[PDB]
Structures are given as structure tokens and as C-alpha cells.
Amino acid sequence: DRFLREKQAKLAEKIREFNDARQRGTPFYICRDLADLESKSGDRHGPHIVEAYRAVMEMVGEHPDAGEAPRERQFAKMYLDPNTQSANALAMRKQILKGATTFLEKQFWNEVNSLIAKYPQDANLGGLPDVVSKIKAYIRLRIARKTLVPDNVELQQINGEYVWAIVFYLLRAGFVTEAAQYVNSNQAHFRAIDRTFSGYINSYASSEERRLKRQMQDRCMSEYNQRIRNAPEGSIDPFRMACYKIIGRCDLSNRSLDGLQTDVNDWIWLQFNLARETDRSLELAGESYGLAELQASIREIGLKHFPKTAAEDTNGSFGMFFYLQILAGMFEQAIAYLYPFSYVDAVHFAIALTYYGLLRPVDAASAGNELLSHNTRSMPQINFGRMLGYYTRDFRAANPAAAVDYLVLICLNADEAAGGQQAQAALCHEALRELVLESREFSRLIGDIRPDGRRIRGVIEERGPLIALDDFIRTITLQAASFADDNGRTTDAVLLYHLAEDYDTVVSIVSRALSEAISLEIGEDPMRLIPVKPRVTNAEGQVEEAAPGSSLSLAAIDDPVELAKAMMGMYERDHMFWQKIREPNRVACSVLLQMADIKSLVEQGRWAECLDKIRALDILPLTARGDPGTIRSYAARFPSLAQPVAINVPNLLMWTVLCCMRQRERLMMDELKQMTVDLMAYTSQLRYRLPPHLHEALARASA
Amino acid sequence: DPTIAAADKIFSNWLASQ
Ligand SMILES: [Cl-]
Secondary structure (H helix, E strand, C coil): CHHHHHHHHHHHHHHHHHHHHHHHCCCCCHHHHHHHHHHCCCCCCHHHHHHHHHHHHHHHCCEHHHCECCCCCCCHHHHCCCCCCCHHHHHHHHHHHHHHHHHHHHHHHHHHHHHHHHCHHHHCCCCCCCHHHHHHHHHHHHHHCCCCCCCCCCCCCECCECHHHHHHHHHHCCCHHHHHHHHHCCHHHHHHHCCCHHHHHHHHHCCCCCCCCHHHHHHHHHHHHHHHHCCCCCCCCHHHHHHHHHHHCCCCCCCCCCCCCCCHHHHHHHHHHCCCCCCCCCCCHHHCCCHHHHHHHHHHHHHHHCCCCCCCCCCCCHHHHHHHHHHCCCHHHHHHHHCCCCHHHHHHHHHHHHHHCCCCECCHHHCCCCCEEECCCCCEEECHHHHHHHHHCCCCCCCHHHHHHHHHHHHHHCCCCCCCHHHHHHHHHHHHHHHHHHCCCHHHHCEEECCCCCEEECHHHHCHHHHCCCHHHHHHHHHHHHHHHHCCCHHHHHHHHHHCCCHHHHHHHHHHHHHHHHHCCECECCCCCCCCCCCCCCCCCCCCCCCCCCCHHHHCCCCHHHHHHHHHHHHHHCHHHHCCCCHHHHHHHHHHHHHHHHHHHHHHCCHHHHHHHHHHHCCCCCCCCCCHHHHHHHHCCHHHCCHHHHCCHHHHHHHHHHHHHHHHHCCHHHHHHHHHHHHHHHHHHCHHHCCCCCHHHHHHHCC | CHHHHHHHHHHHHHHCCC
């Protein structure tokens, strides 16, 4: 769980680099990279998954040392073609076999070189050692180790060289041409021991299909039956049999290397080497062995030799079977088989494959299936969408950016090839929508605000190109905004409603939060708001390109007054926002700000100023001395006043009255005491629109 | 049958080598 948490971290960042590369057009090698990470994490099943990755590399054409890599989903159209009897299908099947056969030849060839490099003086090669020369050296070293053959078997020799061993191990290493031309370099010597073989191997090396001419195939098969199949034991060089099995595909019913010293990799190689696909409607029973039969073989080996659950596993052998299923292009089954043993590896390997288009996804209509299901055509499907979303719920709460990287990968299957082109893109949207509503990181996901009101694009809309992205971001903002205004999260609501360009609503929200703060008595603790989540988490020991004050998010605003000033500040400086705010609304907030200031003066202890700013409001009749008539003029204005303003008139009085009575304390005095009681007339005339018993508290503070 | 019987021999032997 701890070493795992680290593994998930390094992988998550690679998936970050991955998406940056896809968007910018930078060369990227997903399989090569994912393999490197897996080889450095030291799992027991590691090496098998590393091998599988590299097998897919050879299959797909991911060659970093040549700056060559296939385009995004280059095989989707080919692999996802439902018509199993199409040109696309036949080509896809061929490439799997070719890739696996090629990979398994390279695998062996590397061993040959390693063994030679381990014994240089013994190898004794010339100035420009050719492959044939290296193979002979490899045979020599095997001989010295007594690991070339099983005892009691004598091999045909020529000048001290086991000619058949040399031919076989050249075919084993994929050097078919060099095998044929080695025989041709020794025509006479081969003519003496086998007059027909040269003809067969030359025909074998001259074609793309690695097949013999029909006429030759008949002759080779007959000969193999009459002179080799049922011959006295030890009457035939074990390697010669092997060469015939390979060259002539003799005895496909027994795909094994009995007389030879072989391991599991030699067996696997033989299976792919002998496999052939055909465009012909029919094949002879004795020549019928392609990928379908090969896959069927691997399938049965799984049930018989390997575990399905993690409780049945012990030493990490499940990796071998996953590896086999990959070679065979049983991709959906391979991933489904691995998930229980290592869901992390399963998830990322599925990403690697889906990127190239080698993983059949469920359609959107059946997006509620278990990991592995089958479609109408009985073909295996992986629920890529759900698998990802499910995977991100191990860290989306404490790392929403990483979660966005994965959810975006859902749109890999959202192209013309997948079939459900736009339905898969819709799934990705909902996955991201449920992420935004579930988290409070709006400054990160949707965007932040600069002092002048300009938006700082969020992570999601920057990944727009990678998810078919207009109104989606605008939509999820409005709902996330309404959800915040209704649930009393004032700061989030202001952030979101501004991003949605609903500036008028923003003013109403700050007016309300500011109105509530003004109402509280002078003495209570100041009203505090929960600040929006910061857009960046600058850290100890780390650098902060994002300095405080550069955005609303990094302003740490938790005071309704400071909030109102900030938003009203930018809205009034730029006429663009201003004209989009209703006059009564903007004017109301302005009045509230004055009120908050008037309140600050009282709580501070400045009487002279209080009176002035209150007089400046021109809401109360405070220039009248005893005038009965003018009072009415203002009483009729009350209903016109905005709610959030009117609701604090009761508070104003208590301030205006208290301050005036204090002013009496420090003609002028008589006049001040006059208005003081004049307010007490203001209330009365409109007493059934203020609190019930304000007088008694008012007159009290009035001595 | 021979190929199937042979595969069993190679993988059984391989498993025991773990
Ligand atoms: Cl074998």
C-alpha cells in the first residue's frame, strides 16, 4: 500500500507526460516507458509484464532507437473490424504472429550474443563476424557445457561442424536467408547427406509467407513421411527433423522439439513460427494452423496450468500466462486475467493497448458491465470507461489533477474506429462532471480569476483538444454554482458564477453575504467565509511561480467585506462587467459597503465621521429639524430600497441614534438631540416594517 | 494429442522450476 502508493505516483506523472505529448505532438513511447517503470519497481511478476510490453512494442512497431512510433490508434480500424473474414482482420492476425515470431527470435538472438560476450577468448571470432560465424561459436559454447543435446544421440558432422544444428539455430534466430545461403555455401556437403533439403530451404526463404511451392510441399511431405517420420530411433539427426518440421510444416499435429535441448521459450516460439493465416476460403486439414488454433491452445493451457484468483497464486506465475495471451493477441482476455493479480498493471497496460487501438471496448449502452463481457458476436470486451473512473477513486480526492489525466483517456475510444464515436465522449464528460461536483477544486479544474477579471484556464478546458472540446464547461459550472449558492458556500459560488460570466448574480451573492455580516452586533466575532480552494499548493522547499495576489484563488479571501470590495472593484473599473449588472443591484452593494464602513467607524470609536457618511447615504431624513412634511418624502422611499439594504436600517438607527446621543455628550447639541428623537419618529411612522421593540432598546442607549 | 500432451509436460516442468 505504501510502495504501491509510490508506484501509482510515478505512473500518474507518466500519464501526465503522456497526455502532454499527445496534445503537443511530441514523440512518445508509452510501452517502452511503462516497461521501464515496471522493471524498476521490483515485483515478482514484473519481468513477465516487462516482456509483454516489449512484445507489444515489436508487434506495434514502437522502436525508440530509430525514432519510429505508430500514430495514435493506428490499428483501431484494423483490429475492431467485426468481419473476421475481411482484409482488415487477415492483416491484423498476420501482424500479431509476425510481431510475436519476430520478438521471440530477437529474444533468443540476444541470448546468443550474451553468451558469446561472456566468453570472448573462447568465441575467437574474426574481423567482421557474420551471423553464421556467431551461431557456430554459440554451438561451440553449448557443446563445451554438454547442453546441446540429450546423451546417446550422434549428430551428422562436416568438418567438425554440426551442420543441422547450425541451420536450425539460424531459423530459431530469424535469419532465414542466412540459413539458406549457409546451405548454399556447402551445396556439395549437403547434397551428399540430403539431396533435396537445399531446394526446400531456398524456396522457404524466397517467399513472404515462408512457404514452399505446392509441388515442393507435396514432395517434402511425402519424403518426410517415408524417410523421417517413422524411422528407427537415432537414424535421424534431431536437428534435421526440427529443420524439416519448420521448413515444411511437417506434423503440425505435434508442435514440439523432442530430440533437442529446449526450454519454454523455444516451445512458445515454435507455436508462432508454424502458424499461418490464409486468404483462401479453405485449407488442407494437415496444413491448417493459424492464430485461431494458437489462441485456442493458449486458452486451454491457462485453465490447466494457471490460477484465476490471487489466493491460488504463490510465486507470481500468473505473469507468464498474461505474457502468453499478449503474444497471441488475446488482449481483452489478458487484461481481464491480470486485473485480480495486479489491477494497477492491468489498468495501465489497457491504456497502452487502447492508445494503439488494440482493445475492444464495450459500447456506451452497455457501460454497466463487469470488467470483461462479450458482445453480440461473442467477442470479448473491456469496460475501459468504468475501469478508469473506478481506478481514479483511490486518489481523486487528494489529487484531482491526476484523476483528470486518466478520465481523459476515456476519449481514446471516441474516434471513428471505435463505433460509439460520440457516446464514449459523453461518458468522459459525465466522468469529469461527477469529479467537479464531488470536489471543491474549482480553481484548478474549471479556472481561476485574475485581479482584472480575466480567467486563468483550468486543467480540463486545457485538455479540451483531447476530449472533443462548447457549452460543456459552461454547463457544469452553472450547476456547480447553483449547487454552491443553495448550500451556502458563498466563496465557491462567487468564483463559479464569474467564470460563467454571470456577473449580476455575483454582485447579489456578495451583497447578501455582506448584508449578513453588517447585521451582526458590534461586539460579536466578525462573520467569516470558507475560502475557495487555492489553484496551486506551493510547498515548503519548492518554488512558487504562482505568487499570492496574482489570482482570487491565491488571495485567501475569507472576509465578506474584502470579497465585496474585490469583485465590485474589478466590475466597476471595467465597463464590460459593469453594464452587465443591474443598476439597483450594483447601487445596493455600494450602499452596503458604505454601511460596513460606517459600522467600522463606530466599532473603532470615531463619532464625527459616522455622522457624515450616514448623512451622505441620504436614506434617512436627517437635515429636517422639525419638518413634518419632508419626513414623508423619505417614508415613501422605503419600499423602493433594496431588501439587503432595508433590512439593516434598524441597525443604522441604533448607530445614528447612539452616535448622536454621544455627540450631545462631547444649539448644535440641542439640534443633535432633536434628530436623535426624530429617528424615533422615523421608526414609528414605519414601525410595522422594522423589528417589534426597537424603541425600548433605542431609548435605553439614548440614556 | 501429442502436442497437447507435450505442452503439459513443458509447463508442468516449468511450474516446478519456480
Ligand atoms: Cl518444445
